[PDB]
Design a protein around this ligand. Structure first.
Ligand SMILES: [Zn+2]
Length: 56
């Protein structure tokens, strides 16, 4: 195995909102930031992959 389990360093995987491709949002976010941005992405926010961001 390996060991990488630390606070802040959190991998919140969402998607490219236009190709459904997996965006593992590797962030360094405290629990409450992670929670808050969870609610935003659950609500209305979403991201795009750099391929789609370059294409449209
Ligand atoms: Zn995309």
């Amino acid at each position: 195995g390996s060991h990488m389990a630390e606070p802040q360093r959190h991998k919140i995987l969402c998607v490219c909102c236009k190709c459904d491709g997996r965006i593992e949002l590797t962030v360094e976010s405290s629990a409450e930031d992670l929670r808050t941005l969870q609610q935003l992405f659950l609500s209305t926010l979403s991201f795009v992959c750099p391929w789609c961001a370059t294409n449209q």
